[PDB]
């Protein structure tokens, strides 16, 4: 269970737009940990790992 720290606008290619304060569920990461595959109310896709953090 994670929260978004900053807005991120999808750059396509299975990335996912997220908004600061939104909750996400994390499925995993890419090979170097820089991208995170996440689920939000808006769908599923890749977001910057550094743009989210655990919450609770």
């Amino acid at each position: 269970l994670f929260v978004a720290l900053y807005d991120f606008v999808a750059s396509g290619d299975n990335t996912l737009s997220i908004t600061k304060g939104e909750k996400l569920r994390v499925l995993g990461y890419n090979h170097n940990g820089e991208w995170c595959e996440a689920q939000t109310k808006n769908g599923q896709g890749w977001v910057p790992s550094a743009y989210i953090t655990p919450v609770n």
């Binding site: 900053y6 991120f8 820089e34 991208w35 890749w46 977001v47 910057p48 550094a50 743009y51």
Partner: peptide, 10 residues
């Protein structure tokens, strides 16, 4: 995942 790096945190 994208083959390009993500944006740096602001």
């Amino acid at each position: 995942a994208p083959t390009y790096p993500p944006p740096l945190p602001p």
